[PDB]
Design a protein around this ligand. Structure first.
Ligand SMILES: Nc1ncnc2c1ncn2[C@@H]1O[C@H](C[Se]CC[C@H](N)C(=O)O)[C@@H](O)[C@H]1O
Ligand SMILES: Nc1ncnc2c1ncn2[C@@H]1O[C@H](C[Se]CC[C@H](N)C(=O)O)[C@@H](O)[C@H]1O
Lengths: 247, 247
């Protein structure tokens, strides 16, 4: 594997990115994320789409009358976003955001961005900085227990030992990889200057793709309910969470 | 298909029961459960093995110096337990125990006994009655979410719908079935007269059986850590819990 920085990996695949997440599972997950955004973002306001990639969620909010800026360190992702019609795009990393303090009511960090940033402390610090008091961070991240199950399936025993300590493993494709940090419950606990508002599981159950196609509405309603159950969310494929900047 | 009382099913398969559960996975789960018993029963005391079957756990305790009585409504299971060297055996159901009150320090209801009892109110009440103040119930039960995931792979959606309401499904053989009630968190919340001391996941991850044999110590120790993690236990194959009779 060639070891890349995250944005260098995304520079290589930007133009195929959207086509990779058009499976029944990913359609389902997008529908869930979309329903959650409409739940937490009641009214139009100022939003930073951080690591916003090809602009999926920026467009979603633009078309609902929000004032949206997309930020991303991948020049190719940004170019794809611009072509798709995202109006405000900026090249930057989460670790060092070029926006003044208190500029946004909400920051999105969807598609596991905070699992990819190289310095989580600076990243959470910058997010808190750019939000108004009581602003929300709305994010999804990789789940430690899902990674661990996957590693056990792909028989990575020399690697599990390290991973249990670091929570960090490689991700990517057959030829190119970058590092991901998979979150545990204690990672979302007493974050400095944030109140945890909600945590939810995305993909609490695994469904065969065939059944998702056959029964999308039924399965979306089930996952809606299951995502709200605290006792089971760390079973999920990915983790969604919301923080509120303390006053 | 034939529908049976739980103990009628066990009367049919009693002579094969020990042979059926001799697999790598179950060898692993038994090692987990044995280690938990040693943790919670640090001294020889008076134990009731309720639905103790062929006496696996009665014998485990007898050889460690405990005073154990095995109770089970299946005559054939009792006969197998006697032949294996279980000294004290009684034919009864959990819903109506012919023992005096306050007679045991602990009651074991292992191998999902409480998922099979027809009346959990009566069963829980009797258990409470035969325990001394601060006596323990130590038990394992089927996990609702594990059943649901299995059904999502295999069963008609209409069966899933019914199961979401009832938490009950048939178990057994292609030719013989009885009903199991799979537990949720809410079921272990505020049981009258008991304090929940601990809840643990048994078989939090899935392993290929081939790999369980190759890396048994490694897998045992990992599962031992994961079973103590409250955030992930509803992912587990089965649920282990400990209640204390309060005052
Ligand atoms: N340090 C970083 N700061 C901000 N974004 C980053 C950082 N490292 C990687 N990224 C970006 O995170 C994105 C992960 Se892909 C998710 C894209 C979008 N949020 C969606 O959900 O569709 C990539 O576009 C990548 O360039
Ligand atoms: N109402 C009931 N009360 C007590 N035991 C029951 C009841 N219904 C079924 N059982 C018993 O529950 C047992 C489940 Se099999 C488990 C046996 C033993 N506990 C072990 O772990 O190996 C069977 O022996 C069955 O006969």
């Amino acid at each position: 594997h060639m070891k890349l920085r995250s944005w260098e990996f995304y520079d290589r695949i930007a133009r195929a990115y959207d086509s990779m997440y058009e499976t029944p599972k990913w359609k389902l997950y997008h529908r869930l994320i979309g329903s959650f955004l409409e739940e937490y973002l009641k009214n139009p306001c100022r939003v930073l789409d951080l690591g916003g990639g090809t602009g999926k969620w920026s467009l979603f909010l633009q078309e609902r009358g929000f004032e949206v800026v997309l930020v991303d360190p991948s020049k190719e992702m940004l170019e794809v976003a611009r072509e798709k019609g995202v109006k405000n795009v900026v090249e930057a990393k989460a670790e060092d955001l070029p926006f003044p303090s208190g500029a946004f009511e909400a920051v999105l960090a969807l598609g596991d961005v905070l699992s990819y940033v190289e310095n989580k402390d600076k990243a959470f610090s910058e997010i808190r900085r750019v939000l108004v008091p009581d602003g929300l961070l709305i994010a999804t991240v990789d789940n430690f227990y899902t990674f661990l199950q996957q590693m056990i399936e792909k028989d990575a025993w020399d690697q599990i030992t390290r991973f249990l300590k670091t929570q960090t493993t490689s991700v990517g494709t057959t030829l190119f990889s970058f590092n991901s940090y998979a979150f545990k419950p204690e990672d979302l606990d007493s974050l400095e200057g944030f109140e945890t508002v909600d945590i939810r599981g995305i993909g609490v159950m695994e469904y065969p793709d065939e059944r998702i196609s056959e029964r999308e509405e039924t399965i979306f309603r089930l996952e809606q309910e299951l995502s709200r159950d605290r006792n089971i969310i760390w079973k999920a494929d990915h983790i969604f969470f919301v923080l509120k900047k303390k006053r």
